[PDB]
Amino acid sequence: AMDFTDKLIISRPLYISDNADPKCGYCNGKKDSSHKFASPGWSDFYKGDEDKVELQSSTVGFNSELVNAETYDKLCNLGFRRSGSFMYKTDMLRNCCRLYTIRTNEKYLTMSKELKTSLKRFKKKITSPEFKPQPKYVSWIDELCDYEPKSTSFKAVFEPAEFTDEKYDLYVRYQHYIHSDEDNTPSQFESFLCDTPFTDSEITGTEKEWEQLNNWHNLQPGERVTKNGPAHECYYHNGKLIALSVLDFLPSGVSSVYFIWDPDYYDWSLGKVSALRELALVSKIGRPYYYLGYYIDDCPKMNYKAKFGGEILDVCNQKYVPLSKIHQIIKHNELFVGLNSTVASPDSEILITSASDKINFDEPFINAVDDIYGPNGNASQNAITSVAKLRKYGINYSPDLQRSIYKEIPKDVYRIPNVVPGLVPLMEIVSLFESGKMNELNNNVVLFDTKINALRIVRDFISEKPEIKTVITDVIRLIGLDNTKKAIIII
Ligand SMILES: [Zn+2]
């Protein structure tokens, strides 16, 4: 009698770290000393010795077999992104590049000369001279929603996120045009952009639901669309597929997964046009945010997302700050951890589950990164003490006793570092245990116990084997206690 449409079905978490040269495709392991470290305190720790540090690229995450749109919305707002069915994030303390989750909307959008030009050229490419413009347009959104549906040469169509040979061929051509002529197999395209982990209703939908979404240009204020889940938006120019947008519809807005286009159409600036159309779509369907993925201030292929404005997730506070308020202090690849300036100096990682006095980015605030996560910050020692306290509950963690977070020139993939920004701090995990809150897992969390090859509801968490309790605790670190209560964890 299990309701699988209310479940997050996941594999045990993985922590994957290796040299950023060559594993990081954003920086290739090449940074100036001024951008190399996560904070000024770590820069100072390595002053004159920056060459002894080998930058690593590190992610943490879990494979999903089943997720619904509301849960994926929560995961995006925790800082995760899906790569096919794999939900991941970087370790922002240790990673070579500082990746921030960004979201925006037409409110934050400040239409620049460049962007206006891309729309003006798009209108001209697709509009017949017979087109008669309306006397006035309140905004560029109403203008686009007038001329685009009247074009006879250009049509965009939303449909299920399913593989076709014609989409794959377009993918291969786009990937070759950016740097990828290898690792371009049909299977890789299918897993990355098709074959999603969502519920069957969210993938297939209904004929009416797709019809409704495909008339989005004519939605009136206050109307909505029922669509949630993954979609493809196919761009056709005289019947030829010239671009493909892969999009996830969430209760809070639309997430761009990827966008490919026919290299012959370089003159159409389809990257910009598609982003603006998706900003218009978000506005027309009455949802609040457009998610472009990760923002990296020092990477041009990722910092273009700032042209569309918006706010950045501070994963330690679980709150967004406008990018304009912090751009000046993240422009050397720093980690930002917000602290209202009126708040005492922090002797610990910020509490994520016991989050009463949430930061207010409207009041004055500072970057507390070095007080918490610097070389003389409190996080590491608090986490070592917490590892020892968690032993009595049968949690098989080991203390991270190295002096530095960075690898120096003189691997268990199930071992997460004690200290990772945005994961529940180990000191808070101790609090959950001491207060009895971990027993809220009982009668809630489900295991797919691969020995029995059967589902079972956890009834007495503390009497489970330590291997199991450790895995569950790492899922809690990643997604929090309340989301874990709706998980099925494969072990
Ligand atoms: Zn990097």
What is the number of other CB atoms lying within 10 angstroms of the CB of residue 96?
A: 26
With contact defined as beta carbons under 8 Å apart, do 394 and 471 qualify? no
With contact defined as beta carbons under 8 Å apart, do 248 and 255 qualify? yes
* The amino acid at 364: P
With contact defined as beta carbons under 8 Å apart, do 242 and 169 qualify? no
Of 190, 231, 239, which Cα lies nearest the Cα of 209?
A: 231
User: What size, in residues, is the chain?
Assistant: 491
Query: Distance (Å, rounded) from C-alpha 98 to C-alpha 284?
Result: 33
With contact defined as beta carbons under 8 Å apart, do 379 and 419 qualify? yes
* The amino acid at 99: L
* Residue 333 φ/ψ region, left for φ over 0, alpha for ψ in the -120 to 50 degree band, beta for the rest: left
- DSSP helix, strand, coil percent of the chain (3-state; round to 5): 35, 20, 40
Q: What count of Cα atoms within 13 Å lies in the side-chain half-sphere of residue 45?
A: 20
As a whole number of Å, the end-to-end CA separation of the chain is 21
Helix, strand, or coil (residue 230) = strand
For ligand 1, the distance from its centroid to the CA atom of residue 9, given in whole angstroms, is 30
Run of H or E including 154? strand 154-159
With contact defined as beta carbons under 8 Å apart, do 336 and 315 qualify? no
For ligand 1, the distance from its centroid to the CA atom of residue 294, given in whole angstroms, is 13
With contact defined as beta carbons under 8 Å apart, do 328 and 137 qualify? no
Q: Give the DSSP letter of residue 350.
A: P
Query: Distance (Å, rounded) from C-alpha 338 to C-alpha 335?
Result: 10
Of 32, 14, 34, 147, which Cα lies nearest the Cα of 89?
A: 14
**Whether the bond into 22 is cis, omega within 30 of 0:** yes
With contact defined as beta carbons under 8 Å apart, do 283 and 105 qualify? yes
Of 8, 121, 102, 37, which Cα lies nearest the Cα of 292?
A: 102
With contact defined as beta carbons under 8 Å apart, do 350 and 337 qualify? yes
With contact defined as beta carbons under 8 Å apart, do 438 and 366 qualify? no
Phi, psi for residue 261 in degrees, rounded to 5: -150, 160
Q: What is the dihedral of CA 470, 472, 475, 480, to 10 degrees?
A: -120
Tokens standing for 401?
A: 């006793």
Tokens 């489900």, located at residue: 446
Query: Distance (Å, rounded) from C-alpha 406 to C-alpha 400?
Result: 12
Count helices and strands (H / E) in the chain.
18, 18
Residue 97 annotated in ligand binding = yes
Query: Distance (Å, rounded) from C-alpha 45 to C-alpha 401?
Result: 17
Which residues are paired to 63 by β-bridges? 86
With contact defined as beta carbons under 8 Å apart, do 364 and 339 qualify? no
For ligand 1, the distance from its centroid to the CA atom of residue 26, given in whole angstroms, is 5
Helix ranges restricted to H, 226-350: 270-284, 300-303, 323-326
Tokens 């007080």, located at residue: 371
For ligand 1, the distance from its centroid to the CA atom of residue 384, given in whole angstroms, is 28
Query: Distance (Å, rounded) from C-alpha 294 to C-alpha 10?
Result: 23
For ligand 1, the distance from its centroid to the CA atom of residue 33, given in whole angstroms, is 13
Query: Distance (Å, rounded) from C-alpha 231 to C-alpha 248?
Result: 6
Instruction: Render the burial of 316-326: b for 16+ CB within 10 Å, e for the rest.
Output: bbbbbbebeeb
Q: CA of 10: how far to CAs of 85, 153, 183, 409, 419, in Å?
A: 10, 44, 26, 36, 23
For ligand 1, the distance from its centroid to the CA atom of residue 23, given in whole angstroms, is 8
With contact defined as beta carbons under 8 Å apart, do 30 and 97 qualify? no
Q: What count of Cα atoms within 13 Å lies in the side-chain half-sphere of residue 319?
A: 17
Q: Could you write out the DSSP letters of every residue in 80-142? A: -EEETTEEEEE-TTTBSS--EEEEE-TTT----HHHHHHHHHHHHHH--TT----S--SSHHH
For ligand 1, the distance from its centroid to the CA atom of residue 44, given in whole angstroms, is 20
Could you give the domains of the chain? 4-104+310-410+415-490 (no CATH), 113-287 (3.40.630)
Helix ranges restricted to H, 93-220: 113-126, 140-150, 165-177, 186-193, 200-204, 207-214
Residue 234 annotated in ligand binding = no
Tokens standing for 71?
A: 């849960």
Residue 194 annotated in ligand binding = no
> Exposed/middle/buried for 369, CB within 10 Å: 0-12, 13-18, 19+?
buried
For ligand 1, the distance from its centroid to the CA atom of residue 361, given in whole angstroms, is 28
Query: Distance (Å, rounded) from C-alpha 299 to C-alpha 100?
Result: 12
Q: Give the DSSP letter of residue 198.
A: B
With contact defined as beta carbons under 8 Å apart, do 380 and 419 qualify? yes
Residue 27 annotated in ligand binding = yes
Tokens standing for 284?
A: 């027309």
Query: Distance (Å, rounded) from C-alpha 312 to C-alpha 292?
Result: 11
Which residues are paired to 90 by β-bridges? 59
Query: Distance (Å, rounded) from C-alpha 225 to C-alpha 245?
Result: 19
Method: X-ray
For ligand 1, the distance from its centroid to the CA atom of residue 210, given in whole angstroms, is 39
With contact defined as beta carbons under 8 Å apart, do 113 and 91 qualify? no
For ligand 1, the distance from its centroid to the CA atom of residue 95, given in whole angstroms, is 7
Tokens standing for 130?
A: 């017979």
* The amino acid at 176: H
